[PDB]
Design a protein around this ligand. Structure first.
Ligand SMILES: [Mg+2]
Ligand SMILES: [Mg+2]
Ligand SMILES: [Mg+2]
Ligand SMILES: [Mg+2]
Ligand SMILES: [Mg+2]
Length: 59
RNA sequence: CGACUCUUAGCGGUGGAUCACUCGGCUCGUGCGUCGAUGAAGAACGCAGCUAGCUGCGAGAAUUAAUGUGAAUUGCAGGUUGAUCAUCGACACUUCGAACGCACUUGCGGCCCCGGGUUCCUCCCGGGGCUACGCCUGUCUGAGCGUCGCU
């Protein structure tokens, strides 16, 4: 071939993709942060009740 | 006289000594002599109907399963096919931390696979699995006017 540049760079190298012979974890972790765990409980204070009454919103 | 002061005694205060108790120490001896990338020691934050501390525990959060035991736990409520305790082999085990995508603000990514938008056509949202350094054996892809062999 021809060398038109004075510098030497590391040649392009083919690299494989991970192909494990066994998953490291037996099962995926259950999603502990779900919709039931998102909401804990509503608020019942004076400001919350007024906010529900007028602003059409929940707390 | 009366006040004040002093002494002694009774009683009452003040104080917490002495004595008697002791689920604590100290010392000696005996058997065993076991941590961690399958993530340790340590730290942080959370978890109880009423819970601050101590203790216990980890979003399955003062505990799940299993076994033994056999009618309680208790401060107040409430509700034998096994209550409560103990054992502990199944399961689970938040964030940091050797701490591991990059940094330490919990900020910013990349790749692959799923569920929402789509009805993959790409974005966007959610979920899951990987993405640290060094090193060993093997595999693949390479480099060298290094040593050569055929053209
Ligand atoms: Mg006196
Ligand atoms: Mg608490
Ligand atoms: Mg049980
Ligand atoms: Mg039982
Ligand atoms: Mg900064």
């Amino acid at each position: 071939k021809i060398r038109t540049s004075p510098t030497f760079r590391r040649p392009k190298t083919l690299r494989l993709r991970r192909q494990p012979k066994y998953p490291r974890k037996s099962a995926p972790r259950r999603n502990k942060l779900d919709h039931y765990a998102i909401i804990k409980f509503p608020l019942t204070t004076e400001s919350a009740m007024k906010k529900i009454e007028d602003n059409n919103t929940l707390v």
